[PDB]
User: Fold ferredoxin from Sulfolobus tokodaii str. 7.
Amino acid sequence: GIDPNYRTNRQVVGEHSGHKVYGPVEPPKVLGIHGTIVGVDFDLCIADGSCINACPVNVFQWYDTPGHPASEKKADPVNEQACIFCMACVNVCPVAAIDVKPP
Amino acid sequence: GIDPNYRTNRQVVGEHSGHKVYGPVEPPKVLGIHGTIVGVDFDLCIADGSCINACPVNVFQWYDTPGHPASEKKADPVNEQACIFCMACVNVCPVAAIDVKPP
Ligand code: F3S
Ligand code: F3S
Ligand code: F3S
Ligand code: F3S
Ligand SMILES: [Zn+2]
Ligand SMILES: [Zn+2]
Assistant:
């Protein structure tokens, strides 16, 4: 599962669709974590889709990541700021790849 | 159109589904304004639906108001806190019944 201390343990290295990306990032095998309010560890995500299936406010969208060993698609927190802190995604993810921290 | 100063001009008289309701409220003809972040004047709303049709984060839901002269259904800001301040609803409403104020 995702490191609950990722925001302090990792370096921010870039930005994607309005959110920060925490490294290391060495495409295509290592993609890091996307998001600050709603963080998704792309290296753990296996594209199960329960998060997208549970979120009532459309926080996630599928984002293609060809060449990644865990999956070739990931749930990207494009609308992380719409999060109403349901904590559903955090609990439905079979690999515990999501961490939500209210700002 | 809605009074942009409604939050100070009107009295809060109740709560509905997690949001405040600003009076006067004398059902069924006078229902007031629902919401603080995303305020919808139920007395102006005619159930056009453009707001629901435009909102990407599901802020609104239909709420029945039988007996109201403007319409018998209203767009209720059930998820006002998911608002990402698109200002779309504010502009699509044909009667300017919506006012959005970031907290
Ligand atoms: S595996 Fe990925 S698709 Fe969602 S349910 Fe977990 S973050
Ligand atoms: S289910 Fe959606 S509302 Fe936030 S707690 Fe997860 S991104
Ligand atoms: S009329 Fe009502 S249904 Fe929406 S578009 Fe205007 S608040
Ligand atoms: S379109 Fe939706 S995101 Fe807010 S500005 Fe209106 S309730
Ligand atoms: Zn991203
Ligand atoms: Zn309401």
Summary: Strands of chain B lie at 12-16, 19-22, 33-34, 38-41, 61-64, 73-76, 98-100.
